[PDB]
Amino acid sequence: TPHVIQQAQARELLAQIDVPQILHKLFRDLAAGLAVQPAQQLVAFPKGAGDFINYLGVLAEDGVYGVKTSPYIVPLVTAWTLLMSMHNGQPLLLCDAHELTTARTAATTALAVDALAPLAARRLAIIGSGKVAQAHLRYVQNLRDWQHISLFSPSLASASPATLAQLTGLDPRLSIADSCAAAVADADVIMLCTSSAGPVLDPAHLSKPALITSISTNAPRAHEVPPHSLNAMQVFCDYRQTTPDAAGEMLIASEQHGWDKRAVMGDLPELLSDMAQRPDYQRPVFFRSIGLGLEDIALANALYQLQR
Amino acid sequence: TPHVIQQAQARELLAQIDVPQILHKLFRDLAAGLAVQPAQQLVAFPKGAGDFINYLGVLAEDGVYGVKTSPYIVGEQGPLVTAWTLLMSMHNGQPLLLCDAHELTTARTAATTALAVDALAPLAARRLAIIGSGKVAQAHLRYVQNLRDWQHISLFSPSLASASPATLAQLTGLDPRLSIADSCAAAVADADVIMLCTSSAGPVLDPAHLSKPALITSISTNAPRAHEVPPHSLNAMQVFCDYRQTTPDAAGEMLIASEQHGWDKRAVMGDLPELLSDMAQRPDYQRPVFFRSIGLGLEDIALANALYQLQR
Ligand SMILES: NC(=O)C1=CN([C@@H]2O[C@H](COP(=O)(O)OP(=O)(O)OC[C@H]3O[C@@H](n4cnc5c(N)ncnc54)[C@H](OP(=O)(O)O)[C@@H]3O)[C@@H](O)[C@H]2O)C=CC1
Ligand SMILES: NC(=O)C1=CN([C@@H]2O[C@H](COP(=O)(O)OP(=O)(O)OC[C@H]3O[C@@H](n4cnc5c(N)ncnc54)[C@H](OP(=O)(O)O)[C@@H]3O)[C@@H](O)[C@H]2O)C=CC1
Ligand SMILES: NC(=[NH2+])NCCC[C@H](N)C(=O)O
Numbered sequence: 001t002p003h004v005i006q007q008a009q010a011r012e013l014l015a016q017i018d019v020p021q022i023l024h025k026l027f028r029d030l031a032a033g034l035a036v037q038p039a040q041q042l043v044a045f046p047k048g049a050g051d052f053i054n055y056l057g058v059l060a061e062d063g064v065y066g067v068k069t070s071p072y073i074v075p076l077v078t079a080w081t082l083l084m085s086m087h088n089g090q091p092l093l094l095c096d097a098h099e100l101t102t103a104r105t106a107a108t109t110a111l112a113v114d115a116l117a118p119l120a121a122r123r124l125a126i127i128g129s130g131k132v133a134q135a136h137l138r139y140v141q142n143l144r145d146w147q148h149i150s151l152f153s154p155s156l157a158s159a160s161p162a163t164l165a166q167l168t169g170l171d172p173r174l175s176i177a178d179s180c181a182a183a184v185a186d187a188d189v190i191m192l193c194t195s196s197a198g199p200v201l202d203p204a205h206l207s208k209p210a211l212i213t214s215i216s217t218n219a220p221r222a223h224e225v226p227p228h229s230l231n232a233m234q235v236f237c238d239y240r241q242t243t244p245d246a247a248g249e250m251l252i253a254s255e256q257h258g259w260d261k262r263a264v265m266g267d268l269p270e271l272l273s274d275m276a277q278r279p280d281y282q283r284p285v286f287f288r289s290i291g292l293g294l295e296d297i298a299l300a301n302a303l304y305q306l307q308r
Numbered sequence: 309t310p311h312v313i314q315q316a317q318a319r320e321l322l323a324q325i326d327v328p329q330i331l332h333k334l335f336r337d338l339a340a341g342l343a344v345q346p347a348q349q350l351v352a353f354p355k356g357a358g359d360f361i362n363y364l365g366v367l368a369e370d371g372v373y374g375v376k377t378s379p380y381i382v383g384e385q386g387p388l389v390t391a392w393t394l395l396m397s398m399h400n401g402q403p404l405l406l407c408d409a410h411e412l413t414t415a416r417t418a419a420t421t422a423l424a425v426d427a428l429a430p431l432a433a434r435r436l437a438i439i440g441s442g443k444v445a446q447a448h449l450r451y452v453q454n455l456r457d458w459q460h461i462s463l464f465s466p467s468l469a470s471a472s473p474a475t476l477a478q479l480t481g482l483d484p485r486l487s488i489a490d491s492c493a494a495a496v497a498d499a500d501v502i503m504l505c506t507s508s509a510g511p512v513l514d515p516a517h518l519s520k521p522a523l524i525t526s527i528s529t530n531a532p533r534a535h536e537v538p539p540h541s542l543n544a545m546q547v548f549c550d551y552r553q554t555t556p557d558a559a560g561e562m563l564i565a566s567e568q569h570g571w572d573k574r575a576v577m578g579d580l581p582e583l584l585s586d587m588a589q590r591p592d593y594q595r596p597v598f599f600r601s602i603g604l605g606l607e608d609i610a611l612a613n614a615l616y617q618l619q620r
């Protein structure tokens with residue numbers, strides 16, 4: 001010790017672990033007070049040069065705590081996790097976590113879809129076409145009997161047909177769309193996976209009530225839906241204690257639209273321990289993720305056990 | 309990269325660096341805005357098992373930032389406390405060094421209070437008192453000893469009454485002007501500067517029981533709301549602290565005073581950034597002068613940055 005895993009060895013070990021299971025237990029653990037999730041901490045660099053966010057989690061059940069540090073350098077973004085023993089207080093592992101973050105962000109949203117979407121939903125829509133979108137598809141594809149998967153990204157119109165093959169070769173049911181409108185037609189679940197700062201979708205412009213997931217974070221107060229729309233949705237989030245205070249749309253809505261965090265109907269720990277209100281679909285249903293360091297300390301712990 | 313430094317290499321690299329200078333410039337850097345010092349974060353472990361504190365700094369001027377993580381693990385036989393620092397580049401956002409900082413912490417804690425003493429104590433003070441006799445007090449002594457013409461140095465700690473003859477000599481051999489004492493009372497007599505370096509949870513000294521007004525430094529942090537002086541006595545001192553924006557919100561005495569005794573953080577007359585950039589009120593000695601340190605990550609990142617430059 002301490003072992004230093006870089007990108008290569010990380011991807012390798014990331015392929016050998018069951019992320020959804022790791023996460024499912026984590027949150028259950030979280031709910032039970034066997035895991036602690038401090039708020040994230042953003043620290044600005046001087047001279048507009050950028051920032052970094054640190055993420056914590058404590059996994060007492062595994063006897064490890066850690067920190068993930070993620071700097072935005074002006075447009076360079078990285079992620080590095082340091083895992084520490086809760087027994088001898090020594091470092092166990094330092095791990096490049098570029099890929100582990102993509103995984104856990106997708107898997108985390110997957111657990112929301114499995115718990116929140118109608119059991120017999122059939123239509124899926126996916127906005128954004130980068131790795132997080134990609135990864136989103138892989139972790140949600142087998143969660144319901146999807147009869148149609150549409151994704152759409154501005155770039156795709158003028159896209160290399162080869163790259164399209166890569167996308168189309170992630171699920172045979174998937175077809176590339178031409179608009180955001182088209183993709184989310186008659187959709188039951190709509191997974192916003194963009195880097196947008198601003199709304200990529202208005203919920204009250206949907207044909208029918210749908211589950212709407214959002215993961216956008218890398219922008220001051222970034223949001224993927226109109227902040228005012230939260231007042232006409234059934235709002236969920238990864239974690240109730242921390243995310244409402246940092247999620248762009250929730251901040252904007254409470255400051256301007258009369259929205260109150262107390263409206264959040266449930267979070268992952270509550271849903272996955274049967275202590276949250278499953279929603280009707282009399283109104284759209286929104287789930288917000290911004291990441292959570294438990295997600296990051298669980299993954300890095302997983303790699304460490306294998307490392308060992 | 310990233311090079312991993314364990315204890316031995318750390319102490320040796322530590323031995324080859326001017327902690328005081330690095331730190332002085334650091335705080336000047338702080339004051340200019342070329343360096344950022346976020347508050348410290350404390351996260352409790354479940355089931356009374358302990359906690360950890362993280363410390364941040366941004367050293368834009370050195371092109372790096374970092375985190376120092378310090379856990380307190382409660383083991384029945386004893387409490388384990390450690391310190392590890394991770395230093396990240398602000399250019400490529402890659403890790404540059406991961407470094408055991410058990411001793412770097414000791415250094416920086418001593419050197420910091422040193423800068424307060426060089427900035428706050430009379431130019432012609434000649435009496436020095438040291439409470440606590442651990443490595444932290446010992447380091448304070450080696451960083452404050454050449455700062456004035458000391459005519460007498462006294463340290464006291466409860467263990468010293470009945471200790472290894474030779475142990476005494478280890479300490480004695482740090483300064484020829486030093487003497488051990490049999491009480492805290494005895495050590496602080498006619499004291500110009502009194503450097504509390506203990507692990508006490510509660511007061512080891514009432515400043516209103518001193519013969520004359522002195523500079524009184526404090527470091528104790530290892531306890532919930534730990535304090536080395538009565539909280540109420542701050543309302544009758546000229547209070548300084550390492551950094552004004554953070555330390556008042558977490559320091560025990562200051563918390564308790566503001567809660568119970570009508571004290572108000574606005575009272576803090578200055579911090580090290582201000583002092584060392586000439587925008588703080590050096591005080592008179594009509595009242596005792598108090599300086600509070602609780603550690604600040606920028607100190608940790610500076611020192612780690614130093615080792616990394618040598619390592620390179
Ligand atoms: N919640 C969490 O834990 C995390 C969240 N994130 C957030 O998610 C993003 C990660 O995605 P990633 O794939 O890595 O980044 P990319 O930039 O590679 O992909 C983002 C995609 O979103 C699409 N997009 C951007 N704007 C719009 C719009 N107005 N309408 C429709 N689609 C749009 C882009 O399409 P085009 O190709 O046309 O640009 C792009 O393909 C980050 O920007 C971050 O904000 C990231 C990490 C963790
Ligand atoms: N502000 C900062 O930046 C930092 C502060 N600290 C604080 O300082 C301590 C670290 O010092 P360190 O030397 O390593 O710890 P040690 O436990 O090794 O030494 C503590 C010393 O304080 C003395 N002491 C304890 N209680 C009393 C009392 N009631 N009256 C007089 N003396 C007393 C002890 O004497 P005896 O031997 O007789 O018990 C001992 O010599 C930690 O407890 C922590 O709270 C630590 C690191 C950084
Ligand atoms: N503003 C920043 N420094 N962000 C870094 C990117 C954070 C990224 N979404 C993560 O959770 O790893």
Ligand SMILES: NC(=[NH2+])NCCC[C@H](N)C(=O)O
Nearest residue numbers: 359360361378379380391603
């Ligand atoms: N309660 C804790 N976990 N404290 C960690 C030790 C703090 C120590 N004074 C340092 O600066 O390293």
